[PDB]
Nucleic acid binder design. Structure first.
Ligand SMILES: [Mg+2]
Lengths: 60, 133, 237, 173, 45
RNA sequence: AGUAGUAACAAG
RNA sequence: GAUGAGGCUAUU
RNA sequence: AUCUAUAAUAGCCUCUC
């Protein structure tokens, strides 16, 4: 990143943490992520990968 | 023995640039991947319940015999011998910061070889491979 | 279909054939022909394995009626097939280790103590010699193999280890099996080459399907709509 | 601010913030947009051709060669039969025995896929029979209470089992 | 090494013990009486 | 009392 | 009553 | 050129107010 800085410009680093990381992430978004990632997989594997986000969406 | 039959050179003070590389921790006379080593150990110690005679073991067949010669009448628990064989065969490779000496004989002394501001000349005992030279 | 197999072959034979197929991951219903082949192979294996017994002097002798159970101590032949892969491999490795012979690369069907050899018994539908040579291609001499055929054609190995009575009995049993399956109109059932691609199965039940259906973001009625939307729509911009 | 409804499987109150209204301030927000997530994933895929396919193939192979005993490698795990925490191996063995009670023998096949299929099917069983731990209390003068646990058969309904399977046991770190 | 098999532990142990007894008898490790006792016990199991 | 700190111990 | 993941370490 | 390959248990470090 330092070498890739445009000549004469400025490079700035942000040290950051995410607030309420766990409270705000949604299992439905993870189900969508799993569906997108396993696009070219057999149906059985897609269902298997979808199970866990489904279980987390209905967690008690 | 490698530590004892070793010579120590001068210690120098100055900048040392260390790069993090995946290096072997301890020297091994014979090195094979964990699956091959496990197959060889099973053949040596538990030939009866060894399973399929994998062709990958062919190269080591002679070695197995040798080991079966040494452990024919050993009253030691088989698991301890198996882990001895794993120590002698299976390789442990870790990411460590090194500077100009990556041979396993030097990685053993890595804590004493150098820091970030000093270098220690070390001559390990034993023998060194022609490839390393 | 399966009624004939259940009636003719004993419970142990069918159980062991089913276990072997499960080990090989083949559905018995989709491939009953393989079930029948394994059953007949195990039947011939046991028939040959139940024809000699080692004596106190280590010599084979035949069996007959009127003999007590105590007399039959150790069989002449040890059966390898019809057993779980792990147990059979352990048996073969133990025999090889204790008889000073290298372990053959492939699992055997029987072991003979008199000659201390591994026997690969095979059943062929075509020429016996052709199948014998094809099986010879693998190892050849490391495992003396003998082939039987449905046309009363046999190819015994170089070192014969059985008498004519046993071979005749095996051939007669095979012929009786052929006759009963022919009169029952099952030969065409087995001859058919019907083996479609088979893969892993993971089906979803009612409860999990409904849980997934209600586990979708707002704007989707069910999970099928979600999957179609994810697969097809372009989210660019 | 998301969609609130009642779960038809368990009867619980469900809140769905996905695809919800965009935040109007800087407070924490769970209203992720599916379209934006998919766009980010598409960007990741096109920066890394074949990455998703390769990862899915590798995961599929690993799952295909994975055994049930892999579930024994965890720490204290929630046991639904006793509704407590037990070592991962203990919880797995108890679940396997309970499934054997309820005509669910997938674990015998050895692989993880049959066991997970067994779990899915167990979610559908109208009634669940298992082994639980019951304590007998005795009065030891000093008076103190002495607890003797023992194994007893127990039964729960479909909804109770479903809720237990979805339950998370909470503690303090 | 983790043992592998879809069969019961009892069956594997029984077959292993049967093989051990037979090979000991053939190698002379076990005499007649002990082999008979082992065979009877295995058959009972 | 005290320790301690959003909840506990100060025996069961 | 003490969880998930990653890295390193010791032992069987 | 270490990329491969790698059983289990335990510990230490890192990652809602
Ligand atoms: Mg930070």
């Amino acid at each position: 990143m330092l070498s890739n800085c445009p000549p004469g410009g400025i490079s700035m680093t942000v040290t950051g943490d995410n607030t309420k990381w766990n409270e705000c992430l949604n299992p439905r978004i993870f189900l969508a992520m799993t569906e997108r990632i396993t696009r070219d997989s057999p149906i059985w594997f897609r269902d298997f990968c979808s199970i866990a986000p489904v279980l987390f969406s209905n967690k008690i | 023995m490698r530590l004892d039959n070793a010579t120590w050179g001068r210690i120098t003070f100055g900048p040392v640039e260390r790069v993090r590389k995946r290096v072997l921790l301890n020297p091994l006379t014979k090195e094979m991947p964990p699956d091959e080593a496990s197959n060889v150990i099973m053949e040596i110690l538990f030939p009866k319940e060894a399973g399929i005679p994998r062709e990958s073991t062919w190269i080591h067949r002679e070695l197995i015999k040798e080991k079966r010669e040494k452990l024919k009448g050993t009253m030691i628990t088989p698991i301890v011998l198996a882990y001895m064989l794993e120590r002698e065969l299976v390789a442990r490779r870790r990411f460590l910061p090194v500077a100009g000496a990556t041979s396993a004989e030097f990685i053993e002394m890595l804590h004493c070889l150098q820091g970030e501001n000093w270098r220690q000349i070390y001559h390990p005992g034993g023998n060194k491979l022609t490839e390393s030279r | 279909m399966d009624t004939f197999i259940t009636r003719n072959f004993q419970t142990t034979i069918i159980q062991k054939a089913k276990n072997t197929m499960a080990e090989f991951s083949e559905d018995p219903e989709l491939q009953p022909a393989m079930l029948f082949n394994i059953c007949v192979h195990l039947e011939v294996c046991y028939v040959i394995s139940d024809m000699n017994f080692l004596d106190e002097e280590g010599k084979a002798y035949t069996a007959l009626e009127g003999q007590g159970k105590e007399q039959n101590l150790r069989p002449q032949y040890e059966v390898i097939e019809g057993m779980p892969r792990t147990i059979a491999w352990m048996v073969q490795r133990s025999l090889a280790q204790e008889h000073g012979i290298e372990t053959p690369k492939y699992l055997a069907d029987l072991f003979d103590y008199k000659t201390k050899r591994f026997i690969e018994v095979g059943i062929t539908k075509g020429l016996a010699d052709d199948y014998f040579w094809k099986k010879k291609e693998k190892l050849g001499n490391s495992m003396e193999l003998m082939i039987f055929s449905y046309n009363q054609d046999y190819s015994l190995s170089n070192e014969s280890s059985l008498d004519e009575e046993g071979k005749g009995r095996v051939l007669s049993r095979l012929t009786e099996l052929q006759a009963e399956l022919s009169l029952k109109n099952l030969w065409q059932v087995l001859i058919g080459e019907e083996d479609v691609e088979k893969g892993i199965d993971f089906k979803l039940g009612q409860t999990i399907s409904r849980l997934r259906d209600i586990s979708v973001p707002a704007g989707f009625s069910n999970f099928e709509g979600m999957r179609s939307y994810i697969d097809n729509i372009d989210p660019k911009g | 601010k998301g969609k609130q409804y009642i779960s038809d499987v368990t009867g619980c109150t469900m809140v769905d913030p996905t695809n919800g209204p965009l935040p109007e301030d800087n407070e924490p927000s769970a209203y992720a947009q599916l379209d934006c997530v998919l766009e980010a994933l598409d960007r990741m895929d096109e920066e890394h051709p074949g990455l998703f396919q390769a990862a899915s193939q590798n995961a599929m192979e690993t799952l295909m060669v994975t055994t049930v005993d892999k579930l024994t490698q965890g720490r204290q795990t929630f046991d639904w039969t006793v509704c407590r925490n037990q070592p991962a191996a203990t919880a797995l063995n108890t679940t396997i025995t309970s499934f054997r009670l309820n005509d669910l023998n997938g674990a015998d096949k050895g692989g993880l896929i049959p066991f997970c299929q067994d779990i899915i099917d167990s979610l559908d069983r109208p009634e669940m029979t298992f082994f639980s731990v019951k304590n007998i209390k005795k009065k030891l003068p000093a008076f103190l209470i002495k607890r003797i646990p023992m194994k007893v058969k127990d039964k729960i309904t479909k909804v109770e089992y479903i809720k237990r399977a979805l339950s998370l046991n909470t503690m303090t770190k | 090494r983790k043992p592998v098999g879809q069969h019961s532990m009892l069956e594997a142990m029984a077959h292993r013990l049967r093989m051990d007894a037979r090979l000991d008898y053939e190698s002379g490790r076990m005499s007649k009486d002990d082999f008979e006792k082992a065979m009877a016990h295995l058959g009972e199991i």
